């Protein structure tokens, strides 16, 4: 996609003890028009991994199709091996970089989140293919707004509990609705735990509009 | 000798023996197919033999639909037959895409037949051992029946047969066309069933025969249901 078309903004993830939670708005906006409002930007790659994407929905839909088949193929092989969250991240990094090299970039910037072998993994892959792993990740304008709130809680307390983490993502999603135009109220939250990946359905944010009367 | 054994080599008397050997394969199957053209309808009847009770009867068919309005019965090696049907279906669609109108039956036989000549002239491949009979309605020329053989010959016939009893079947049909009475849909179907039955001496039951019909009133190829086949069979016995 040389030019992005229908796009979505901000997927946030933080690593709780025992898993990672990633949350996303469900809006694909055609350049300032909220054209698609029930699209899901979070996918279950495998029981141990989930990926969410910010950017052209089309490129994400292609990546879901390619990645999904790659997972299905391993399962048919039935060797008991499976792709770790780290592996899916490595592949995406090579893939996004390859398209950048061919100057046919995939616009999506994605968060790979997974818990395998008792260790949580959260990683970032950009369109230009920059990849890193970190305790909390926010794509989009989230990096500018949500990441500061997430980092502060993490620096003071390095390890967080699932309840604490879900609360933080709800709070961070609230800020993004308040200060980012491309955002939408409805969001989905998905958590990888030892048990598996479960994606909660439309969850909405209570909003405080008190300052309005202050004028 | 050694004149046979490669399609390309010609016999000292110019006979391309391998192509002739292929026509023998159609007979090895042991099944016969008869097609007759009526004033308003074209019917293809073939013998359905199910070797084992376990095999699902629905899956075994020699009647395939090349396109909504063209139907074919392929006699010969089963695998080769399916291969040709796919090529026909591809060719039929490619005509609609490129030229915008449904392929005329004659042109489908011509294309399929021409593909067979390439096999007959090129060394590596083997002539597919199957014969396809296509039935269709052309608005300009009414009902049409065409047969393409492994050689690449593509003649169109008022009535024709392929298989073990083809010669006998042709004789029976020839007598019936010579005493021409024209054929109504019922007669066209009845003539076909009587011919297959008489040549095989089978006295068929509805299960053993698969009959497919194209009519001017309903142009789409339809494979008749066992009940419909039984109705015609019952009438033949009654009269």
């Amino acid at each position: 996609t040389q030019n992005p078309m229908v796009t979505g903004t901000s997927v946030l993830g933080v690593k709780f003890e025992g898993g990672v939670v990633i949350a996303a708005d469900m809006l694909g906006s055609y350049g300032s028009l909220a054209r698609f409002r029930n699209i899901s930007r979070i996918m279950r790659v495998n029981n141990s991994t989930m990926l969410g994407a910010s950017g052209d929905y089309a490129d994400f839909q292609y990546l879901k199709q390619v990645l999904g088949q790659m997972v299905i193929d391993e399962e048919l092989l039935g060797d008991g091996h499976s792709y770790s969250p780290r592996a899916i991240h490595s592949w995406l990094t090579r893939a996004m970089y390859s398209r950048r090299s061919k100057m046919n970039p995939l616009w999506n910037t994605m968060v790979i989140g997974g818990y395998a072998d008792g260790e949580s993994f959260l990683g970032y892959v950009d369109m230009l293919g920059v990849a890193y792993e970190a305790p909390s990740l926010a794509t989009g304008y989230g990096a500018y707004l949500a990441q500061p709130l997430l980092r502060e809680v993490l620096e003071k307390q390095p390890v967080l509990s699932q309840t604490e983490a879900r609360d933080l993502v709800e709070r961070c999603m609230r800020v993004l609705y308040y200060r980012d135009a491309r955002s939408y109220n409805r969001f989905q939250i998905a958590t990888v735990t030892e048990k598996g990946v479960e994606i909660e359905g439309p969850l909405s944010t209570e909003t405080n509009w008190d300052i309005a009367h202050m004028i | 000798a050694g004149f046979d054994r490669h399609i390309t080599i010609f016999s000292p008397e110019g006979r391309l023996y391998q192509v002739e050997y292929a026509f023998k394969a159609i007979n090895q199957g042991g099944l016969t197919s008869v097609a007759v053209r009526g004033k308003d309808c074209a019917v293809i009847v073939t013998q359905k033999k199910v070797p084992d009770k376990l095999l699902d009867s629905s899956t075994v068919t020699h009647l395939f639909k090349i396109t909504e309005n063209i139907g074919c019965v392929m006699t010969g090696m089963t695998a080769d037959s399916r291969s040709q049907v796919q090529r026909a279906r591809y060719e039929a669609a490619n005509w609609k895409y490129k030229y915008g109108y449904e392929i005329p039956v004659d042109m489908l036989c011509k294309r399929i037949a021409d593909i067979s000549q390439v096999y007959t002239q090129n060394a590596e491949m083997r002539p597919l051992g199957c014969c396809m009979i296509l039935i269709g309605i052309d608005e300009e020329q009414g009902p049409q029946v065409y047969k393409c053989d492994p050689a690449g010959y593509y003649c169109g016939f008022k009535a024709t047969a392929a298989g073990v009893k083809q010669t006998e079947s042709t004789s029976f049909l020839e007598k019936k066309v010579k005493k021409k009475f024209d054929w109504t849909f019922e007669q066209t179907v009845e003539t076909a069933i009587t011919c297959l039955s008489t040549v095989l001496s089978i006295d068929f039951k509805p299960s053993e025969i698969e009959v497919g019909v194209v009519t001017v009133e309903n142009p789409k190829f339809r494979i008749l249901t066992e009940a419909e086949i039984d109705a015609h069979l019952v009438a033949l016995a009654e009269r």
């Binding site: - | 895409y97 490129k98 030229y99 915008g100 109108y101 005329p104 004659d106 042109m107 011509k110 608005e139």
Partner: protein, 222 residues
């Protein structure tokens, strides 16, 4: 270039101007813009002239192989599809805008094919620089189920409107009438405008032009 076509009760009448202009000078008058695709299909072309001539010719040729093999007169749709797909692949680089008209077993069909591969089956179509002017005449007077003579008049009036109103078009009007039974290619259907008499004779008498050198080589007629 005003090219226009109408569907009459039993056929199609195709009209075109006869002027080819390179830049703003009339390179030629009596240029022919109603090309022959097949006996039953004739197509009028506008846009880059070479592209129109070559594309029509390739399709005319392909349709001849097709008709010979099929053994039946070519259908108009086949002409449209072959033309559209070729144009689409070239992505508008081949700038040929054509009005394709023919009568086939299905009946009378007229199509307008824009350079990018768009096609429209329409009762009346006009294309080219004068198309807008011509369309006005058609919108005003096209009636369904017109008889052939009325149709020839409508198409003549429309090409005429383009000839006078648009700078690019201008010269004689050509009409081609395709009917199930017959085709009449009426070149010079009308000569709307004619060059005025040369009042003064400026003819040069022999010896007017000096010659430095001359060589006469005698061809051997045999």
């Amino acid at each position: 270039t005003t090219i226009a076509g109408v569907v009459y009760k039993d056929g199609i009448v195709l009209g075109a101007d006869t002027r080819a202009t390179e830049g703003m000078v009339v390179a030629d008058k009596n240029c022919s813009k109603i090309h022959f695709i097949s006996p039953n299909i004739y197509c009028c072309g506008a846009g880059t002239a070479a592209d129109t001539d070559m594309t029509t010719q390739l399709i005319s040729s392909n349709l001849e192989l097709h008709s010979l093999s099929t053994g039946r007169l070519p259908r108009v749709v086949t002409a449209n599809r072959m033309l559209k797909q070729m144009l689409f692949r070239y992505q508008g680089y081949i700038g040929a805008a054509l009005v394709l008209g023919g009568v086939d077993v299905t009946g009378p069909h007229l199509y307008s094919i824009y350079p990018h591969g768009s096609t429209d089956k329409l009762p009346y179509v006009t294309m080219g620089s004068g198309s807008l002017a011509a369309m006005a005449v058609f919108e005003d007077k096209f009636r369904p189920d017109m008889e052939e003579e009325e149709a020839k008049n409508l198409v003549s009036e429309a090409i005429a409107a383009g000839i006078f109103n648009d700078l690019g078009s201008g010269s004689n009007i050509d009409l081609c009438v395709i009917s199930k039974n017959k085709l009449d290619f009426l070149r010079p259907y009308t000569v709307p405008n004619k060059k005025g008499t040369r009042l003064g004779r400026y003819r040069c008498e022999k010896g007017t032009t000096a010659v430095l050198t001359e060589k006469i080589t005698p061809l051997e007629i045999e």
